[PDB]
Design a protein around this ligand. Structure first.
Ligand SMILES: *[C@@H]1O[C@H](CO)[C@@H](O[C@@H]2O[C@H](CO)[C@@H](O[C@@H]3O[C@H](CO)[C@@H](O)[C@H](O)[C@@H]3O)[C@H](O)[C@H]2NC(C)=O)[C@H](O)[C@H]1NC(C)=O
Ligand SMILES: *[C@@H]1O[C@H](CO)[C@@H](O[C@@H]2O[C@H](CO)[C@@H](O)[C@H](O)[C@H]2NC(C)=O)[C@H](O)[C@H]1NC(C)=O
Ligand SMILES: *[C@@H]1O[C@H](CO)[C@@H](O[C@@H]2O[C@H](CO)[C@@H](O)[C@H](O)[C@H]2NC(C)=O)[C@H](O)[C@H]1NC(C)=O
Lengths: 96, 119
């Protein structure tokens, strides 16, 4: 892992296999159609972030301070989501 | 604030169909156009389906061969084509909009419309 920085609409539309991305600010995120396996985010922040479609597997969120985040279609549930601060977070749709 | 429009409630027979059309106006900036949810007596809203962005869609597995979604962005509308309306599966149907503007994500909900089944 390498320390993450603050990216405006990162829209990292490529798939990741790295384990961790410790350090995150991610203001106005625009992630779309990214397939994480074995990926983790620790000590990360998300404001006005947007997830379109993530086929996440074995990936969990730790110490993530979501604020005003909409996920639309995702594989994220309490099972794949570790304890962390979430406010004004919405999960419109989910997949099996 | 985006004004959303709800419609299409009432009695339909199994084998018949209804068009529940979502529409919205004001402050629309290439939005994810309203998808559909089913509200039961119990406090909860089941996902139905969405064709909100691009030409792609996700339908719930629970609505396979029952709820079909078609979208016309040039109009900011979504049409739910209700079919296979088995008598027990009634609900209040809701439009769920997502704002993709410069101030970040925002969402809107309508009051919903009640659909029942004729027999
Ligand atoms: C998500 O964000 C919205 C808006 O940023 C939050 O809505 C605000 O929630 C607070 C309670 O935490 C409430 O504040 C109220 O505002 C009036 C405005 O005149 C003011 O007299 C008081 O301060 C009153 O408590 C209200 O529901 C709402 N306020 C505004 C200005 O929108 C919402 O709380 C956030 N989500 C969560 C889970 O907190
Ligand atoms: C994923 O991101 C890549 C890289 O930004 C996009 O590829 C670019 O497409 C544009 C517009 O045609 C070009 O000007 C660039 O040369 C491309 N860059 C690269 C690195 O290939 C790509 O379109 C994005 N794909 C999706 C699905 O969003
Ligand atoms: C969870 O993460 C937050 C920050 O993302 C941690 O709180 C930070 O702690 C450092 C300690 O040097 C302070 O400088 C920061 O100002 C704090 N930030 C916030 C937002 O509180 C917190 O310690 C982490 N907790 C765990 C259990 O990992």
């Amino acid at each position: 892992v390498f320390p993450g920085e603050r990216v405006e609409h990162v829209t990292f539309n490529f798939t990741l296999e790295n384990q961790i991305h410790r350090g995150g600010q991610y203001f106005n995120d625009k992630f779309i159609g990214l397939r994480l396996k074995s990926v983790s985010f620790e000590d990360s922040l998300f404001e006005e972030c947007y997830f379109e479609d993530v086929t996440s597997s074995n990936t969990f969120f730790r110490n993530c301070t979501f604020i005003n985040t909409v996920f639309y279609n995702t594989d994220l549930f309490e099972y794949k989501f570790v304890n962390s601060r979430l406010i004004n977070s919405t999960f419109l749709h989910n997949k099996e | 604030q985006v004004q959303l429009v709800e419609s299409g409630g009432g009695l339909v027979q199994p084998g018949g169909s209804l068009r529940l059309s979502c529409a919205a106006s004001g402050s629309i900036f290439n939005m994810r156009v309203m998808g559909w949810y089913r509200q039961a007596p119990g406090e909860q809203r089941e996902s139905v389906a969405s064709m909100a962005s691009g030409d792609k869609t996700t339908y719930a597995d629970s609505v396979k061969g029952r709820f079909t979604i078609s979208r016309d962005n040039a109009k900011n509308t979504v049409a739910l084509q209700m079919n296979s309306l088995k008598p027990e599966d009634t609900a209040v149907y809701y439009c769920h909009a997502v704002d993709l503007t410069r101030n970040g994500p925002r969402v809107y909900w309508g009051q919903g419309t009640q659909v029942t089944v004729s027999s």
